[PDB]
Amino acid sequence: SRVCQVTGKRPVTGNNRSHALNATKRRFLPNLHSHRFWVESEKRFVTLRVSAKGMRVIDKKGIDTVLAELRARGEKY
Amino acid sequence: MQVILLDKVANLGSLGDQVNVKAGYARNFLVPQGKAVPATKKNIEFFEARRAE
Amino acid sequence: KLTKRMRVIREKVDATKQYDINEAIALLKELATAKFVESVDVAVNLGIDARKSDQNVRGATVLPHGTGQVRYRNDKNGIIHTTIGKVDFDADKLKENLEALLVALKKAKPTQAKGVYIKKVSISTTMGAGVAVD
RNA sequence: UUGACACUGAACAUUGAGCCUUGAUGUGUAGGAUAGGUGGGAGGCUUUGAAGUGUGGACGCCAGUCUGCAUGGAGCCGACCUUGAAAUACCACCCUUUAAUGUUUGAUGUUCUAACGUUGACCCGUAAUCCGGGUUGCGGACAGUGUCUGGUGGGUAGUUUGAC
RNA sequence: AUAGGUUAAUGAGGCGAACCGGGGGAACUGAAACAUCUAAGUACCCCGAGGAAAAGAAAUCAACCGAGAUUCCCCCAGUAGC
């Protein structure tokens, strides 16, 4: 399932409007990428499927602070 | 991103120089190998006297 | 043939650094250690276009101290080499001198004006140094 | 399917630009003057060792200035006159064009590895050619994927195709 | 050191008329054809919940005078607009 494991992003549907305004249902997929994040506290890498934006949330809050919420929600990796 | 040095590493290291390197370079090479310190508010304060002077 | 003398005088200022005029008026009295009554050669750069004849400023500057009149007109590249008095004049006589040129030109500002006027000021005292202020 | 951005990094070299200080560069007519320009206003210089001048960088509209070690040595000019201005006698701002530097991104080349890929090998979770983890080799910032975007597109879909 | 393995403890599972919140989401039809639009975020599908659920105590309106969370009802008005 295409879900960012730190934010909660997911494929939200939309409309692919043409020039002549033809509404055809489409789908906006998040830019997810499986990445290994080195946790120093556990002195171990943690592979996580996160979004590109989610990476920037990690660079701001701190990997450990982020993982605090994951075990808080049970987003088991 | 904003990162503060921990080691020597050339062209961008002098043990304590805050450099704005590229994200990938910091998060996948400098941080995991301890070559640098995640420059967050407290770490900026943790350097100035503890390991700077 | 620039040698030690003018360079020691240039140790007072920097070509890169922009100081305040309150410093340059006191520093120019220490810049010129010459044995003859000199002055300051200021090359003030305009803030508009000096190619359009409707905007160019030409006239007289008011110097209430005393000389008290200096005729000034624009240049080819767009500057004015208006003197700010002799080097022998004191601090407040020079402080009030540059301010006299300011408001006189600011209220006589031309029609199709596009921005704040004074951008670059090139103060160059006779036997002193290369000073850069705003 | 194309390009931009994101995941996406590092150096090295070459090459555009910007920028710091910068040495140069800039002949109307006049001319001791390769006076750019405005140019304040007549002394610089110096015994923290100079001009003339050999050669040379230099610039070379080839009318020339500047001048790197310099035996030389303690002086080498002026302002000023023939200029619409007065001059590398001292002269800034530093620009038009140059070149160097620190830096800054852009685009190409070459290598590297740490992201990333591995339907390569090996060990373990295990009596499982799944998956995951660990070692290691190979590729490697490509590939691939998300968002935007030009092209193509009867593969597919909704429909039109007048009245007389 | 973890991944993993075993046993104990606690909870969950399923059903259910509609009502409620959310994730998806038609066409017929109307437009006297039809593609914007309408139908309608309706039908239907899936998850979750209670007895009600949802919303809820202003980074709201108003208007330079004041009102003060939300919800439901009757007007405002088939008007202002699209």
From the list B45, A14, C127, the residue with the least C-alpha distance to B53 is B45
Residue A55: domain span = 1-77
Touch A-B: 3+ C-beta pairs under 8 A = yes
> Closest Cα of chain A to B32: distance in Å?
6
Contact (Cβ atoms closer than 8 angstroms) between residue A60 and residue A32: no
What is the spatial order of strands in the sheet that C79-86 belongs to?
C79-86, C39-45, C120-125
Euclidean distance between CA atoms C38 and C58, whole angstroms: 25
In this complex, the answer to whether residue B11 has its CB under 7 A from any atom of chain D, a nucleic strand, is: yes
Chain B residues with beta carbon closer than 8 angstroms to that of A48:
none
- Contact partners for chain C, using 3 or more CB pairs closer than 8 A, are none
The experimental technique used to determine this model is: cryo-EM
A-chain residues near B1 (CB < 8 A): 59
Contact B23 A59 (CB under 8 A): yes
Query: Which residue type is seen at B2?
Result: Q
Give C77 CA → D31 C1' in Å.
26
User: Are the C-beta atoms of C82 and C72 separated by less than 8 Å?
Assistant: yes
End-to-end CA distance of chain B: 24
Rg of chain C over Cα atoms, rounded to whole angstroms, equals: 15
Cβ <8 Å between A59 and B31: no
User: Which residues from chain B sit within 8 angstroms of residue A38, using beta carbons?
Assistant: 31-32
Q: What residue segments make up the domains of chain B, in order of their start?
A: 1-53
Taking phi first (over 0 means left), then psi (-120 to 50 degrees means alpha), and beta for anything else, what does residue B15 get? left
Beta-carbon contacts of C102 under 8 Å, excluding residues fewer than 6 positions away, are: C118
Residues 6 or more apart from A67 whose CB is under 8 A from it? A39, A46
For strand D, list residues 90-119 of chain C whose Cβ lies within 7 Å of it. none
Three-state DSSP class for residue C58:
strand
Chain A 14-53 residues whose Cβ is under 7 Å from strand E: 20-23, 25, 44
CA of A23 to C1' of E26 (A): 14
Does residue C83 reach within 7 angstroms of strand D, measured from its CB? Answer: yes
Into how many domains does chain A fold?
1
Compute the C-alpha angle B9/B15/B17, nearest 5°: 100
- Token pair 């350097």 is at which residue? B47
Q: Measuring CA to CA, how many Å separate C99 from each of A71, C92, C107?
A: 68, 11, 13
> Cα–Cα distance between B35 and B6 in angstroms, integer?
6
Does the nearest atom of strand D lie within 7 Å of C74's Cβ?
no
